[PDB]
Design a protein around this nucleic acid. Structure first.
Lengths: 119, 51, 214
RNA sequence: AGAAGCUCAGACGAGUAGGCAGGCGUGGAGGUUUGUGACGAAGCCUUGGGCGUGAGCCUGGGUCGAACAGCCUCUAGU
RNA sequence: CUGCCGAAGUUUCCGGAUAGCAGAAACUCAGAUCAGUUUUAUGUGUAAAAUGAGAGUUUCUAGUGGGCCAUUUUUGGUAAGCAGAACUGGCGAUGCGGGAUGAACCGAACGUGAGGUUAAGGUGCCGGAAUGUACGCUC
RNA sequence: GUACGUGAAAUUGCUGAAAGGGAAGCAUUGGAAAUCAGGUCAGCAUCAGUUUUCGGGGGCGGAAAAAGAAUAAGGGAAGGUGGCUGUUUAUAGCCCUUGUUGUAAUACGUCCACUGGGGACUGAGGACUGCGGCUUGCCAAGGAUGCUGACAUAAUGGUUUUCAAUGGCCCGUCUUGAAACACGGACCAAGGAGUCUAGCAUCUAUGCGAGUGUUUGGGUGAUGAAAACCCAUCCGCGAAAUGGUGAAUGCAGGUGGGAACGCCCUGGCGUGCACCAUCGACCGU
């Protein structure tokens, strides 16, 4: 079964475009006269539980696997029985020596690596 | 059980399941094949064509 | 193994005999009424057809701006939504109900095809307080076996002819969720049906409206 | 058969005062991960990619130069 | 940060206790009781069939105690306005379609989408949709 | 490079790209250009679900349509024809009634578990169970499969900038039934507001239970000894109330309802916790 997302654009905090001090991270407006909380026309949309995606395809990448954070060759071994479910993602602070060791072990085990060509 | 709802009118097979009588219905019957008796009282015609 | 197959096969033939009996009854009742009217016309006599013990009511006005007195009646009629159709036992206790919710609902005399199509397409049963589609006769049998109703044809008969257990059958049928009419209502819809609108009693034109809604 | 779980079916979804539940992030502590790290930790930047309804999280590249994190609990000048 | 439940909008007695609306805990109750409802009967009130819904209580603990607009009855009216009650509504906690624009007008009440069909209002163009059909009036 | 670790935002200069006819930011759908990522995208058939739009055939109904046509009676006349303003089918015809052709047709209403096409959206579920149909099998019967292509240097999906169509009144606070007002807001970074403690009460958890509470203090603790560990005597609350006295009369009392169990052949019988009405006591039990 393919993966379909109910939404692609992120939800931006209101007036985060206008003000540099107002970050784009979503914050629920508590204003009583907030036309955006009132859901007027032309206003931007608010996060709702109706936007939740399919349970059977949630947390899954476009390829159909779930990214799993891996730090060492020991972590990859834990993904032996789920190589068709989880895809190994090497951590960003893993040195170049352990990068190539993790990639080789995962490749031998048949476990996908999401960011293999790095460092 | 019953993942999908199928309309019996549009499904000949589902109609058979629900109604084990549609296999023999004889919808159209010719009953006006004898001398058609024009049945209308003369007084009724006068009342109908009154005023 | 063989016992259940034989019993179900005999039950299937029994339903067929009942459905055949019901179909003959409708044909005879229609034919005899025509013969009675023909003989009255020939003799110059006037023949009055019997009152219709059955009525089909469709809610035509929404849930907004409705007086509390009228609201409670539609709560008692299970007309909790716009374009919802139910069967009502037309009697002296119902005529007064429908006369005071005249501006909000329409109703009329449904023929056999209207009842037959409604239960086939929109037929949903209230099984354990759930909306279960009437997709097979065993659903009706387990829920109305006390009243000797075994199939959809039996349910249609108990609704059309208003039998002794009409209350149980009508309460078993979840209110039909009809669509918006195909072709639309009249130009002005909330005027009374007599005055050119689409509200109130309409007699045999409830059929022409329902076929749009199906 | 993480019964905390798995599975089937139906209905419902605005919501101020108020009520209730589950989560995200931060500093420090106990335990733990044969945890990460000068072959580059943290931070920062980026018209790079991914995940989450959301708070947020992970990652590519660049910059940088010595520390840091995941989980289970504790704690608050959160 | 998301999710769920969700009012009062004011009586009744001295700022309040009370009740009411909303929840929780613990009980009994399905050959039972309820109801912003209608019939029937007795003389508008009282009593017993229709239809719908599982129906009850006890404890205790939050928030509320305003107003606005409109209908009807009625009290006076008055240069003419209006003034006084009652009445249930609408707003108030609430976006959406239409009314060119709008707190009070017509529809409609809300998870995220696809398709279909409508309400109110519309189909010369701005503007989605007949410069449609039939009969009249008007310079 | 001492204007010295890391070098954020505000702000400023340069360069590149682009836009600009009295605001702008934003949202939706795509195009174009740029840049990413990973089978992609089409055509047809047979089906299922929802739906829309054209037809065809056949029952039944009404005044068993009204008409009408053709064809026999009689009647009447004109908006008077031939004829002669006036008349009664003649060298035009019309109207009315009846018969007939008739079981006439058609319109219309209604029904078909009668049928033939065109188009669009959707494919949820994942061994087998079921309800059915045709005959072990097969099937349109508890949710889509089959047959092919093209393309991988691109198609799809994005992300960034921009344009077009459509929409979009500035946020917070305050007042009011409601607005508007009235304040606050040049910009950015960092800091910045229900905290600690004493008492009381509810609920929950935990330990013990007619008991309960070690940490005033003493013992003790070599490895951190302000920890942990051990507990003599008191004391606090509870175990008795009432206004000095100080409690099963009666299985620590009977009746009814009642959780739960048992015996039976739904219901009956027996037992009957908690709690609540009841007669009862004892000095609150």
């Amino acid at each position: 079964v393919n993966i379909i997302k109910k939404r692609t654009k992120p939800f931006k905090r209101h007036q985060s475009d206008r003000f540099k001090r107002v970050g784009e991270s979503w914050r629920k407006p508590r204003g009583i006269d907030s036309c955006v909380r009132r859901r007027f026309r032309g206003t931007i949309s608010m996060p709702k539980i109706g936007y939740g995606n399919n349970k059977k395809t949630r947390y899954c990448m476009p390829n159909g696997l779930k990214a799993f954070l891996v730090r060492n060759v020991s972590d990859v071994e834990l993904l032996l029985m789920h190589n068709k479910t989880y895809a190994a993602e090497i951590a960003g602070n893993v040195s170049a020596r352990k990068r190539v060791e993790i990639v080789e072990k995962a490749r031998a085990l048949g476990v996908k690596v999401t960011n293999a060509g790095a460092k | 059980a019953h993942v999908q709802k199928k309309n019996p009118l549009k499904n000949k097979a589902v109609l058979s399941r629900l109604n084990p009588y549609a296999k023999a219905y004889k919808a159209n019957v010719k009953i006006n094949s004898e001398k058609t008796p024009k049945a209308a009282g003369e007084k009724f015609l006068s009342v109908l064509h009154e005023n | 193994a063989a016992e259940k197959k034989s019993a179900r096969q005999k039950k299937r033939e029994l339903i067929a005999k009942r459905a055949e009996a019901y179909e003959a009854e409708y044909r005879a009742a229609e034919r005899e009424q025509i013969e009675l009217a023909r003989k009255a016309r020939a003799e110059g006599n006037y023949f009055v057809p019997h009152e219709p013990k059955l009525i089909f009511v469709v809610r035509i006005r929404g849930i907004n701006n409705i007086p509390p007195k009228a609201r409670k009646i539609m709560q008692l009629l299970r007309l909790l939504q716009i374009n919802n159709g139910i069967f009502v036992k037309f009697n002296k206790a119902i005529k007064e109900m429908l006369q005071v919710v005249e501006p909000y609902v329409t109703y009329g005399i449904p023929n056999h095809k209207t009842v037959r199509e409604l239960i086939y397409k929109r037929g949903f049963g209230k099984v354990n307080k759930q909306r279960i589609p009437l997709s097979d006769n065993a659903i009706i049998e387990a829920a109305l076996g006390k009243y000797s109703i075994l199939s959809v044809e039996d349910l249609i008969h108990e609704i059309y002819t208003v039998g002794p257990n009409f209350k149980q059958a009508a309460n078993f049928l979840w209110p039909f969720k009809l669509s918006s009419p195909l072709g639309g209502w009249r130009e002005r819809k909330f005027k009374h049906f007599i005055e050119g609108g689409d509200a109130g009693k309409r007699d045999e034109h409830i059929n022409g409206l329902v076929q749009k809604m199906l």
